[PDB]
Design an enzyme around this catalytic site. Structure first.
Site, PDB file in Angstrom:
ATOM      1  N   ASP A 132      -1.261   7.419  -2.937  1.00  0.00           N
ATOM      2  CA  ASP A 132      -1.592   6.393  -1.962  1.00  0.00           C
ATOM      3  C   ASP A 132      -0.441   5.384  -1.903  1.00  0.00           C
ATOM      4  O   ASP A 132      -0.651   4.164  -1.851  1.00  0.00           O
ATOM      5  CB  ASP A 132      -2.910   5.716  -2.358  1.00  0.00           C
ATOM      6  CG  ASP A 132      -3.597   5.023  -1.185  1.00  0.00           C
ATOM      7  OD1 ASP A 132      -3.172   5.225  -0.021  1.00  0.00           O
ATOM      8  OD2 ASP A 132      -4.568   4.272  -1.436  1.00  0.00           O
ATOM      9  N   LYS A 134       2.210   3.127  -0.331  1.00  0.00           N
ATOM     10  CA  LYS A 134       2.313   2.435   0.956  1.00  0.00           C
ATOM     11  C   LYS A 134       2.730   0.978   0.786  1.00  0.00           C
ATOM     12  O   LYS A 134       2.652   0.424  -0.312  1.00  0.00           O
ATOM     13  CB  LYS A 134       0.982   2.521   1.720  1.00  0.00           C
ATOM     14  CG  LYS A 134      -0.228   2.046   0.945  1.00  0.00           C
ATOM     15  CD  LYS A 134      -1.472   2.077   1.804  1.00  0.00           C
ATOM     16  CE  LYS A 134      -2.637   1.428   1.069  1.00  0.00           C
ATOM     17  NZ  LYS A 134      -3.927   2.089   1.357  1.00  0.00           N
ATOM     18  N   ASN A 137       0.755  -1.414  -1.229  1.00  0.00           N
ATOM     19  CA  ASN A 137       0.741  -1.119  -2.662  1.00  0.00           C
ATOM     20  C   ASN A 137       2.091  -1.364  -3.332  1.00  0.00           C
ATOM     21  O   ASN A 137       2.249  -1.087  -4.515  1.00  0.00           O
ATOM     22  CB  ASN A 137       0.356   0.343  -2.899  1.00  0.00           C
ATOM     23  CG  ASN A 137      -1.124   0.573  -2.804  1.00  0.00           C
ATOM     24  OD1 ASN A 137      -1.914  -0.357  -2.974  1.00  0.00           O
ATOM     25  ND2 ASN A 137      -1.517   1.819  -2.535  1.00  0.00           N
ATOM     26  N   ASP A 150      -1.957  -0.125  -7.916  1.00  0.00           N
ATOM     27  CA  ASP A 150      -3.094   0.631  -7.361  1.00  0.00           C
ATOM     28  C   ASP A 150      -3.114   2.094  -7.826  1.00  0.00           C
ATOM     29  O   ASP A 150      -2.854   3.009  -7.039  1.00  0.00           O
ATOM     30  CB  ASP A 150      -3.067   0.569  -5.826  1.00  0.00           C
ATOM     31  CG  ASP A 150      -4.427   0.863  -5.184  1.00  0.00           C
ATOM     32  OD1 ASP A 150      -5.477   0.530  -5.780  1.00  0.00           O
ATOM     33  OD2 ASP A 150      -4.440   1.425  -4.066  1.00  0.00           O
ATOM     34  N   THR A 162      -4.139   6.980   2.590  1.00  0.00           N
ATOM     35  CA  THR A 162      -4.251   6.230   3.834  1.00  0.00           C
ATOM     36  C   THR A 162      -3.766   7.060   5.020  1.00  0.00           C
ATOM     37  O   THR A 162      -2.722   7.701   4.941  1.00  0.00           O
ATOM     38  CB  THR A 162      -3.421   4.946   3.758  1.00  0.00           C
ATOM     39  OG1 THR A 162      -3.892   4.156   2.662  1.00  0.00           O
ATOM     40  CG2 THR A 162      -3.534   4.144   5.056  1.00  0.00           C
TER      41      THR A 162
HETATM   42  C1  LIG Z   1      -2.400  -8.831  -3.955  1.00  0.00           C
HETATM   43  C2  LIG Z   1      -1.480  -9.437  -5.037  1.00  0.00           C
HETATM   44  C3  LIG Z   1      -1.415  -8.832  -6.358  1.00  0.00           C
HETATM   45  C4  LIG Z   1      -2.016  -7.622  -6.766  1.00  0.00           C
HETATM   46  C5  LIG Z   1      -2.812  -6.640  -6.128  1.00  0.00           C
HETATM   47  C6  LIG Z   1      -3.243  -5.493  -6.821  1.00  0.00           C
HETATM   48  N1  LIG Z   1      -4.015  -4.593  -6.161  1.00  0.00           N
HETATM   49  C7  LIG Z   1      -4.501  -3.422  -6.649  1.00  0.00           C
HETATM   50  N2  LIG Z   1      -5.249  -2.717  -5.811  1.00  0.00           N
HETATM   51  O1  LIG Z   1      -4.235  -2.982  -7.773  1.00  0.00           O
HETATM   52  C8  LIG Z   1      -2.877  -5.336  -8.176  1.00  0.00           C
HETATM   53  C9  LIG Z   1      -2.094  -6.305  -8.819  1.00  0.00           C
HETATM   54  C10 LIG Z   1      -1.660  -7.444  -8.123  1.00  0.00           C
HETATM   55  N3  LIG Z   1      -0.901  -8.476  -8.513  1.00  0.00           N
HETATM   56  C11 LIG Z   1      -0.739  -9.313  -7.491  1.00  0.00           C
HETATM   57  O2  LIG Z   1      -0.119 -10.372  -7.586  1.00  0.00           O
HETATM   58  C12 LIG Z   1      -0.747 -10.599  -4.666  1.00  0.00           C
HETATM   59  C13 LIG Z   1      -0.813 -11.216  -3.478  1.00  0.00           C
HETATM   60  C14 LIG Z   1      -0.014 -12.279  -3.508  1.00  0.00           C
HETATM   61  C15 LIG Z   1       0.554 -12.331  -4.704  1.00  0.00           C
HETATM   62  N4  LIG Z   1       0.107 -11.299  -5.416  1.00  0.00           N
END
Ligand SMILES: CC(C1=c2cc(NC(N)=O)ccc2=NC1=O)c1ccc[nH]1
Length: 276
Positions: A132, A134, A137, A150, A162
């Site tokens: 997945d 993308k 991710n 992810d 996706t």
């Molecule tokens: C969405 C996100 C983060 C994650 C998302 C993740 N999503 C997932 N499906 O594993 C995992 C780890 C993660 N660290 C982040 O800082 C993010 C948005 C802004 C800053 N970090």
């Protein structure tokens, strides 16, 4: 190191949201460290028969030890929820920059493409397939190097990723392999240069139709050596994709002319080019 609890943290804003998890920003009180804590509801996980996906994510993330991957620092649980403490990547998702600046110049696509290729070589060398891959991710840290995340739906040597990134072998025998991540790599390169993904259409069935027919086009403004690479990646026969075993691996892929000037050995030590 004693297990941590919910009370050890000051929780803040929602960072991200999927069908089974919520990622929330948290400050550890005793250290003032920030973490991205992923929270999963045990009851919802069970009723949806996801236990195997949750245990796989934990087990895979335990085996990764490379700078281009989000890291798992700790886990704990209370009565209703599981908690996974992960890297907080300050600058968020790559998808936001493709929208924000619209489209990358050749210097920036080349650098970020190479970091993704180094990441996939490491993953595939551990016999692990993402399935997945993308823009959503692929995260960016405060220093603007990538961190891939992810891993619930990975395969460690059933599931489709996706729509816009699934390979044609998934739409037939329903099988996936290392060559599948390489197909999504080719899609992401296209999207870096053109600002949009190669296969778009008004609904999911129409997308799947285009993919098997290999129905897509290049813009005129598309960097030539980068177009030639995308054409050696978006190939219907999976065994014929640059970077796969039957094509003799990552050696030939990194040697492609689009990467002419890249030093592959210390990319995360290098200063990334500014995005504009
Ligand atoms: C969405 C996100 C983060 C994650 C998302 C993740 N999503 C997932 N499906 O594993 C995992 C780890 C993660 N660290 C982040 O800082 C993010 C948005 C802004 C800053 N970090």
């Amino acid at each position: 190191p004693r297990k941590k609890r919910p009370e050890d943290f000051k929780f803040g804003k929602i960072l991200g949201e999927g069908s089974f998890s919520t990622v929330v920003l948290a400050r550890e009180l005793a250290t003032s460290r920030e973490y991205a804590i992923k929270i999963l509801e045990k009851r919802h996980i069970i009723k949806e028969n996801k236990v195997p996906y949750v245990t796989r994510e934990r087990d895979v993330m335990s085996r990764l030890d490379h700078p281009f991957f989000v890291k798992l620092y700790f886990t704990f649980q209370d009565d209703e929820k599981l908690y996974f403490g992960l890297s907080y990547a300050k600058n968020g998702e790559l998808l936001k920059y493709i929208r924000k600046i619209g489209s990358f110049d050749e210097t920036c696509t080349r650098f970020y493409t190479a970091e993704i290729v180094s990441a996939l070589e490491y993953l595939h060398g551990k016999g692990i397939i993402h399935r997945d891959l993308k823009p959503e991710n692929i995260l960016l840290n405060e220093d603007m190097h990538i961190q891939i995340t992810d891993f619930g739906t990975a395969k460690v040597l059933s599931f489709v990723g996706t729509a816009q990134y699934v390979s044609p072998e998934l739409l037939t025998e329903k099988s996936a392999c290392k060559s599948s991540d390489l197909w999504a790599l080719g899609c992401i390169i296209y999207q870096l240069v053109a600002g949009l993904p190669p296969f778009r259409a008004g609904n999911e069935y129409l997308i799947f139709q285009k993919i098997i027919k290999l129905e897509y086009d290049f813009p005129e403004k598309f960097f030539p050596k980068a177009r030639d690479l995308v054409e050696k990646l978006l190939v219907l026969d999976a065994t014929k994709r640059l970077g796969c075993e039957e094509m003799e691996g990552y050696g030939p892929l990194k040697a492609h002319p689009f990467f002419e000037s890249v030093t592959w050995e210390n990319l995360h030590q290098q200063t990334p080019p500014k995005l504009t």
